[PDB]
Enzyme design. Structure first.
Site, PDB file in Angstrom:
ATOM      1  N   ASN A  39      11.484  -3.489   7.884  1.00 47.42           N
ATOM      2  CA  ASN A  39      11.383  -4.812   7.288  1.00 47.42           C
ATOM      3  C   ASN A  39      12.587  -5.076   6.400  1.00 47.42           C
ATOM      4  O   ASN A  39      12.940  -4.204   5.600  1.00 47.42           O
ATOM      5  CB  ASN A  39      10.095  -4.900   6.470  1.00 47.42           C
ATOM      6  N   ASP A 104      11.645   3.158   7.836  1.00 46.28           N
ATOM      7  CA  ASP A 104      10.860   2.157   7.109  1.00 46.28           C
ATOM      8  C   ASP A 104       9.498   1.944   7.766  1.00 46.28           C
ATOM      9  O   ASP A 104       8.725   2.898   7.893  1.00 46.28           O
ATOM     10  CB  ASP A 104      11.654   0.846   7.021  1.00 46.28           C
ATOM     11  N   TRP A 105       9.188   0.710   8.187  1.00 45.48           N
ATOM     12  CA  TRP A 105       7.933   0.483   8.905  1.00 45.48           C
ATOM     13  C   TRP A 105       8.044   0.921  10.360  1.00 45.48           C
ATOM     14  O   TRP A 105       7.055   1.396  10.940  1.00 45.48           O
ATOM     15  CB  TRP A 105       7.492  -0.991   8.804  1.00 45.48           C
ATOM     16  N   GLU A 128      14.403   7.504   5.183  1.00 47.44           N
ATOM     17  CA  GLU A 128      13.738   6.613   4.212  1.00 47.44           C
ATOM     18  C   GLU A 128      12.408   6.107   4.767  1.00 47.44           C
ATOM     19  O   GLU A 128      12.240   4.926   5.063  1.00 47.44           O
ATOM     20  CB  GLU A 128      14.634   5.420   3.859  1.00 47.44           C
ATOM     21  N   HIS A 270     -12.288 -21.989 -30.266  1.00 41.71           N
ATOM     22  CA  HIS A 270     -11.946 -23.215 -29.546  1.00 41.71           C
ATOM     23  C   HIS A 270     -13.098 -24.210 -29.457  1.00 41.71           C
ATOM     24  O   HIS A 270     -12.898 -25.402 -29.709  1.00 41.71           O
ATOM     25  CB  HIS A 270     -11.435 -22.899 -28.123  1.00 41.71           C
TER      26      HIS A 270
END
Lengths: 291, 291
Positions: A39, A104-105, A128, A270
């Site tokens: 991605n 990654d993905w 990675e 309040h």
């Protein structure tokens, strides 16, 4: 020097209805190397790795569903959807054994496929890759807020519209005395249907805080500057410590607003009407005939 | 002992296509006292103050549109909406001069009406009223985070879909050397349509961080335990400082993963392909024949 071209020729294949794209270069005997991107990348990520590997093996790099030049069908794109479409891409090409090059993905996919066809995976080149990340402390600091933001949903709508925070949280928070269930059920009653909480969420998003929304900021400014010059009799009730009108601000307005009488209702946040209505009512009653 | 009941016969008036509930007590003639509630309340908020004013004056306590027993049309319920409905309501009842009793967003309505109709306001009793808030330090700390949350939109989706953050932000953030405009244009081309950015946004929301999503956490934990026992050859590339796999973690997976060679690509964050593709392909290609 790192090349910028994509000098590969487009190869398309139909799979589960969608036309996916993949570069295919190299010979056609032996073990293919399957290049899996992540991605927000596509086969272009591999453009300058592949030529080292092509003169010996088949290099197959597909654009994941909904990415690159593959078609973009309207679905959630959950991880289990990339899984379905990649499995189906592999078999749509008849691939037997493969060597995997993942990132990654792409690496969540490749790893997950290799665990489901171990007999078929002859090697894994990774970089990675996705392991579990136990704590946000292990995300690099310069990127933590950004990725924490990416996972932030509509927080305002989820508090107010979904969990009804303004009824269940703010009313008891902003009244000093505890409310009762009977009182809270009177308050709950017009917003039993979540969709009806639209105004309860638009109100705080309309408040004049730090310059926004600008329209409301200027309108409030204009009526406050009318109020500061008008001789209209004004009666200001205020509590300790208040919320919008803390005690020191009530004092300033006492002299800052023309013809303004202020009244200490005692401890208040309040909804002062819910901490001391008797004093608010009687003081209004006493003030009215003198107008 | 504070009253919990609401002992008021319901009055209704037809205001711009919508039925609106209002409390109507007290004498007829004389100057009416108009109570304006705020968020997230109704005329119920006024229930124990009205008994004090009704002996001497007419008390009118409307439920703002979308609130209380009043009709709930499909508006966005901006302030301008309430200004339209409240104005018509006042005219629908024929009110000439009034005395306002106002609180919260009722105070923003009352003040804004009074500024436009000053000669019609004989008095103003007010409490916890809306004035411009310059900084969030002006907001009570115990409620600051909650009210900032209320005003937080879908931060993830706005960054990735609307602002395209993964392409414009993460890709240059995660590559040590600079990307050229041509490379950025190759990466941009799949998602020039913001709707097509769905996977870009769902991917980071699928990452297994802090146990969420529990299912992606489990699936990724399964192929990682598979990996730690599998003898398939593995080539792990990594850079310094990395992102998902920092140097020291690379070092430990050199031992933890059987049949694993490790290649330091030098400086690098997450898209190592874009920092050292030659060393990556070169080492893959020398790794392949020995499979």
């Amino acid at each position: 020097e790192i090349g910028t071209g994509f000098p590969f020729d487009p190869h398309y294949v139909e799979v589960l209805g969608e036309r996916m794209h993949y570069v295919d270069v190299g010979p056609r005997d032996g073990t293919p190397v399957l290049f899996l991107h992540g991605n927000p990348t596509s086969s272009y990520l591999w453009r300058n790795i592949i030529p080292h590997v092509a003169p010996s093996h088949r290099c197959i790099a597909p654009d994941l569903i909904g990415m690159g030049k593959s078609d973009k069908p309207d679905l959630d794109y959950f991880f289990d959807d990339h899984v379905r479409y990649l499995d189906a891409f592999i078999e749509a090409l008849g691939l037997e054994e493969v060597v995997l090059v993942i990132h990654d993905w792409g690496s969540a996919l490749g790893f997950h496929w290799a665990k489901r066809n171990p007999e078929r995976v002859k090697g894994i080149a990774c970089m990675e890759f996705i392991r579990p990340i136990p704590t946000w402390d292990e995300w690099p600091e310069f990127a933590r807020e950004l990725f924490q933001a990416f996972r932030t949903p509509d927080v305002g709508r989820e508090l107010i519209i979904d969990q009804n925070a303004f009824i269940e949280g703010i009313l008891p928070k902003f009244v000093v005395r505890p409310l009762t269930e009977v009182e809270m059920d009177h308050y709950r009653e017009p917003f039993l249907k979540p969709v009806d909480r639209e105004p309860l969420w638009r109100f705080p998003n309309e408040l004049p805080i730090a310059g926004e929304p600008a329209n409301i900021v200027a309108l409030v400014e204009a009526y406050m500057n009318w109020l500061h010059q008008s001789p209209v009799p004004k009666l200001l009730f205020w509590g300790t410590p208040g919320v919008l009108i803390p005690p020191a601000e009530a004092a300033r307005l006492a002299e800052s607003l023309p013809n303004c009488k202020t009244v200490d209702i005692g401890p208040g946040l309040h909804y002062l009407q819910e901490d001391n209505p008797d004093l608010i009512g009687s003081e209004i009653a006493r003030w009215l005939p003198a107008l």
